[PDB]
């Protein structure tokens, strides 16, 4: 979950490589998108949109292993400057768009890297962010130009508890090289099932494999499966995506002048041709 | 006043110069696309202009390059403009060239009296890409420091020499301060010159042979 | 109109020029005032302006600090390097890559010998040409995009 | 790293030119010549 | 971040023509 | 978009106007 990025990597959620630490636990793999505008003007509210899609009609395993639907979260870094715009600067139709959403700042004062989720998949399908652009004229040290935005969004449950031990959304391999005898199946009247399993004979050998309830099996009885061999099928239907994009804190005077200069040019070009036209004429008062 | 013209004329002979200019005629088949060359040219000079401009602020050293850029970006008067131009103008240039490579080929402009004018072109082109490449790394940021780290290996395949080549152009075994050094050299002094020689070829040859035939 | 003056098929020079592939700037509109001095500045000042505008609406970004221990994932030379890139990256014996790349410049030279057989400018009277040109061009664009895609999904461009 | 608006710009004109280029190989393949060759 | 590329292309291409005809026509409106 | 369009139109618009506008303008006071 979002907050555990926080909790295992404290200072930034994004590796030098571009990684994004989320990733680190969420080992699956699925499309993710941010849209922002192309330019925002200094000091405005604009929408910036995380898309984290999936087949809404589908469910993943839970702890015990029910088969409940699933939940999204993401982290979104906008550029130095950017913040979640003020409740009262959001105007209305946007306020509705944005929804019940818990925007949290990655660390105290990184007001521009925002955590989001868990938040439930069915309607948080995209996820809006009311964001308020900086002002290079009152923040002497915000500068105009174009800046990155890395998204890095995820849906469905993880593969590793911050503590270090496997979850159960994943597949469970094989403790041993060789031949199997018993596929047992505990259930200690609190922490649910446990299909256990054993292997043996070849190297002296007696040793065991407890495997949580969630996956299907695909294994049968007696197999000669070698160590760490696919014994479980694959529970996950969720996983992690990344995005990067570019937005442009545009000062308008630049545009304004530029526009001017575009006219000035149009206008000369006109003069030029016009001109040649007058000479296309005087020119023919000389072939006779 | 004093009659300036004549002044020159007595001495230098301004006059023939003017006639060589005014007497070159434009035929018929020469239609818009035969502006690509010139466009590519205009393109490049914009480079050269802004090129030089940034030579006054940019610092080719691995402690300094990356930041001077963002100086030029953030605190130099119109650096942002100036640097932004050098950037799109590079692109524009590589591309107007390709577009000109088209009008040559499908106008069969590159044929018997003129296979030199084409040969150069290729060279121009290899050089332009070169500017292009070297250029590209001087920011000594993440994206460009992986792209030198990438290509600079490539030649190591090539079998007697080929390392020596890489070593030549990276200035040691790994990438690093020599590389950038060498590269700034590249980019700001070698290619500016080479290009100009061969542009000069590419141009004379043309004033000499005139445009290619009609269709 | 325009303005225009015709060949001079009495000028035995123009002739022998024409003949060696070449008198072509001796007839047509004049290039002085006319082309050079009126419309050229239009092309220039035009060409300028687009870049200016291009530069100002979408100016030029700043990377992170290059780090020689972290490779970016997403890390692409510029555009007119895709084609080669594709080749280079996905052709698994290294000397072939080089070989194949140099072939671009080299080949591209040869052409006007190779294509020197007939005298024909027009891309129409040169079917076998215009074809190979077309073909090449595509394979180009294709490897092109191809470099934008991810390895495996690359050649197929994803669609087979 | 990658720059759409450029790339668009590129194909855009690559076709356009390719285009009009043959448009005039034709337009002339085909009402040819005159004044002498 | 793909809706531009597309956009670009359309205009980049299509505009040429507008300008083209714009030209052409100008030309009609004047006489030659 | 739609406003792109409009603005566009309206912009070329004008210039196109000022063109024609000025031939005649120039033309019929004998300048072309």
């Amino acid at each position: 979950y979002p907050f555990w990025a926080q909790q295992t990597y404290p200072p930034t959620p994004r590796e030098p490589t571009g990684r994004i630490v989320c990733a680190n636990c969420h080992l699956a793999a699925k499309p993710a998108e941010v849209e922002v505008p192309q330019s925002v003007l200094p000091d405005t509210v604009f929408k910036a949109v995380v898309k984290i899609p999936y087949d809404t009609k589908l469910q993943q395993v839970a702890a015990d292993g029910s088969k409940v639907g699933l939940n999204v979260g993401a982290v979104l870094m906008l550029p130095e400057g950017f913040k979640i715009a003020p409740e009262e600067r959001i105007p209305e139709e946007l306020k509705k768009e944005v929804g019940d959403v818990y925007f949290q700042p990655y660390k105290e004062g990184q007001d521009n890297v925002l955590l989001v989720g868990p938040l439930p998949g069915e309607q948080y399908q995209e996820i809006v962010f009311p964001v308020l652009s900086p002002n290079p004229t009152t923040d002497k040290n915000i500068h105009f130009g174009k800046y990155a935005i890395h998204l890095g969004a995820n849906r469905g449950r993880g593969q590793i508890y911050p503590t270090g031990e496997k979850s159960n959304n994943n597949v469970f391999t094989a403790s041993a090289t060789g031949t199997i005898t018993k596929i047992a199946k505990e259930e200690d009247e609190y922490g649910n099932v446990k299909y256990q399993v054993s292997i043996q004979t070849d190297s002296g050998k007696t040793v065991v494999d407890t495997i949580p309830a969630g996956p299907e099996l695909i294994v049968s009885e007696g197999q000669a499966v070698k160590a760490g061999e696919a014994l479980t099928n694959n529970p996950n239907v969720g996983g992690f995506g990344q995005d990067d994009t570019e937005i442009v804190l545009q000062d308008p005077n630049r545009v304004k002048w530029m526009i001017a200069f575009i006219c000035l040019v149009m206008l000369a070009q006109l003069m030029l041709i016009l001109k040649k036209k007058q000479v296309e004429k005087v020119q023919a008062a000389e072939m006779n | 006043m004093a009659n300036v013209y004549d002044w020159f004329q007595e001495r230098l002979e301004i006059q023939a110069l003017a006639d060589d200019v005014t007497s070159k005629y434009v035929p018929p088949h020469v239609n818009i696309f035969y502006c690509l060359g010139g466009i590519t040219l205009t393109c490049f000079l914009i480079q050269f202009a802004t090129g030089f401009a940034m030579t006054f602020y940019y610092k080719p050293t691995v402690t300094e390059a990356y930041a001077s850029v963002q100086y030029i970006m953030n605190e130099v008067s119109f650096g942002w403009l100036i640097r932004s131009i050098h950037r799109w103008s590079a692109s524009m240039m590589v591309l107007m060239m390709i577009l000109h490579v088209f009008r040559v080929y499908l106008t069969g402009g590159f044929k018997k009296p003129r296979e030199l004018t084409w040969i150069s072109g290729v060279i121009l082109a290899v050089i332009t890409v070169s500017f292009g490449v070297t250029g590209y790394s001087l920011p000594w940021d993440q994206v460009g420091y992986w792209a030198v780290k990438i290509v600079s290996g490539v030649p190591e395949a090539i079998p007697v020499v080929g390392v020596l080549i890489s070593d030549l152009l990276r200035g040691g075994s790994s990438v690093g301060q020599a590389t950038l050094t060498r590269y700034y050299s590249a980019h700001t002094f070698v290619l500016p010159w080479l290009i100009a020689v061969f542009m000069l070829l590419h141009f004379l040859m043309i004033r000499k042979q005139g445009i290619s035939g009609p269709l | 109109m325009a303005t225009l003056k015709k060949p001079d098929l009495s000028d035995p020079k123009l002739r022998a020029k024409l003949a060696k592939g070449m008198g072509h700037n001796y007839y047509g509109e004049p290039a002085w005032p006319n082309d050079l001095l009126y419309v050229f500045p239009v092309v220039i000042m035009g060409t300028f302006a687009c870049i200016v505008a291009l530069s100002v609406l979408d100016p030029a970004m700043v990377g992170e600090p290059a780090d020689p221990f972290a490779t970016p994932l997403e890390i692409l030379p510029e555009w007119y390097l895709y084609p080669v890139f594709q080749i280079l990256r996905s052709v698994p014996n290294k000397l072939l890559g080089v070989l194949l790349m140099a072939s671009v410049p080299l080949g591209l030279i040869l052409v006007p010998f190779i294509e020197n057989v007939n005298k024909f400018q027009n891309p129409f009277r040169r079917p076998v040409a215009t074809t190979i040109f077309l073909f090449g061009t595509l394979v180009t664009i294709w490897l092109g995009i191809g470099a934008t895609f991810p390895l495996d999904k690359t050649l197929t461009l994803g669609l087979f | 790293m990658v720059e759409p608006l450029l790339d668009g710009l590129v194909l855009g004109l690559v076709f356009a030119t390719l285009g009009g280029l043959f448009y005039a190989a034709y337009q002339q393949y085909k009402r040819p010549n005159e004044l002498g060759g | 971040m793909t809706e531009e590329m597309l956009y670009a292309a359309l205009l980049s291409f299509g505009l040429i023509f507008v300008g083209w005809g714009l030209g052409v026509l100008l030309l009609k409106i004047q006489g030659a | 978009m739609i406003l792109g369009a409009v603005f566009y139109i309206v912009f070329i618009a004008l210039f196109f106007g000022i063109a024609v506008g000025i031939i005649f303008a120039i033309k019929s006071i004998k300048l072309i």
């Binding site: 192309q38 330019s39 925002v40 003007l41 405005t44 545009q250 308008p252 545009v255 304004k256 530029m258 526009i259 575009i262 040019v265 149009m266 070009q269 006109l270 030029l272 041709i273 040649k276 | 239609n31 818009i32 696309f33 502006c35 | 325009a2 509109e29 082309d35 009126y38 419309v39 239009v42 092309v43 035009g46 302006a49 687009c50 505008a53 291009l54 100002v56 609406l57 | 009009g20 005039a24 | 205009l11 505009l15 040429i16 507008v18 300008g19 083209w20 714009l22 030209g23 052409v24 100008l26 030309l27 030659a32 | 406003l3 792109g4 603005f7 566009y8 912009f11 070329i12 210039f15």
Partner: peptide, 29 residues
């Protein structure tokens, strides 16, 4: 928040007006 648009626009207009003017200028391709 649409001087911004005028902005791209103007890029398009010159681009056009150019070709335009270029063709008009030499009765052109």
């Amino acid at each position: 928040m649409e001087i911004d648009v005028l902005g791209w626009v103007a890029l398009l207009v010159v681009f056009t007006w150019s070709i335009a003017m270029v063709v008009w200028g030499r009765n052109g391709l």
